[PDB]
Paper text:
Ets-2, like its closely related homologue Ets-1, is a member of the Ets family of DNA binding transcription factors. Ets proteins share an 85-amino acid winged helix-turn-helix DNA binding domain (the Ets domain) that recognizes the conserved core DNA sequence GGA(A/T) through direct polar contacts mediated by residues in the highly conserved recognition helix (α3). Several of the Ets family members such as Ets-1, Ets-2, Etv-4, Etv-5, and Etv-6 are subject to autoinhibition in which additional structural elements outside of the core Ets domain inhibit DNA binding. Much of the knowledge of autoinhibition in Ets family proteins comes from studies on Ets-1, which is closely related to Ets-2 (84% sequence identity for the Ets domains and 55% across the entire length of the polypeptide) and, like Ets-2, contains 4 additional α-helices located immediately N-terminal (HI-1 and HI-2) and C-terminal (H4 and H5) to the core Ets domain.
Crystals of the Ets-2 DNA complex were obtained with an Ets-2 construct spanning residues 325–464, including the N-terminal (HI-1 and HI-2) and C-terminal (H4 and H5) autoinhibitory regions and the DNA oligonucleotides 5′-ACCGGAAGTG and 5′-CACTTCCGGT. The crystals belong to a primitive monoclinic crystal system, space group P 21, and diffracted to 2.5 Å resolution with 3 copies of Ets-2 and three 10-bp DNA duplexes in the asymmetric unit. In chain A the entire autoinhibitory module can be seen to form a complete folded helical structure and associates with the core of the Ets domain via an extensive interface formed by H1 and the β1-β2 loop. The HI-1 helix, which was suggested to undergo a structural transition from ordered to disordered upon DNA binding, is well ordered and forms a helical secondary structure that packs against the C-terminal ends of helices H4 and HI-2, burying two predominant aromatic residues (Phe-331 and Tyr-334). For the remaining chains in the asymmetric unit (chain D and G) the entire autoinhibitory module was either completely or partially disordered and was not modeled in final structure. There are also a large number of side-chain residues that transition from being ordered in the autoinhibited form to being disordered in the other two chains; a significant proportion of these (Asp-387, Arg-401, Arg-406, Lys-436, and Arg-441) participate in intramolecular salt bridges in the autoinhibited form.
Residue numbers in the entry: 329 to 460
Amino acid sequence: MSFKDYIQERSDPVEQGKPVIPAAVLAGFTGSGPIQLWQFLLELLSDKSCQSFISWTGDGWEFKLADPDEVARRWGKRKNKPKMNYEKLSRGLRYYYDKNIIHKTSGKRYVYRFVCDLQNLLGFTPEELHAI
DNA sequence: ACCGGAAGTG
DNA sequence: CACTTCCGGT
């Protein structure tokens, strides 16, 4: 059962102004518990009003933190960690490397790649998601 | 910027 | 476990 299948259970599978993949729902789906960093990044990447500071690149699930500081600010906010910065947030991303959640794109600045089979998990292909 | 150990929070 | 905080090194 994908996430796309999961959201059908909601009264509003996609609320008007809200993102397509809220981290809370995704946490509820995965059953992880509190919001995780890789889930928060998807929420922003599925939010049109966040395109400016974070956005998908061309191929697959590669994304770029255009403005790392604004991402780290919203991450601190969501986590109630006032002193959050990219230096610490990115250290959270490096812990995903050996866990195969996210990987660093070698050579590109602030560019990362989801590597946890998002096609199967979300139910959306890269192209289908990147339409919205 | 990016890395990954160490240790602390919860 | 999942970071958060800090660090010397690349």
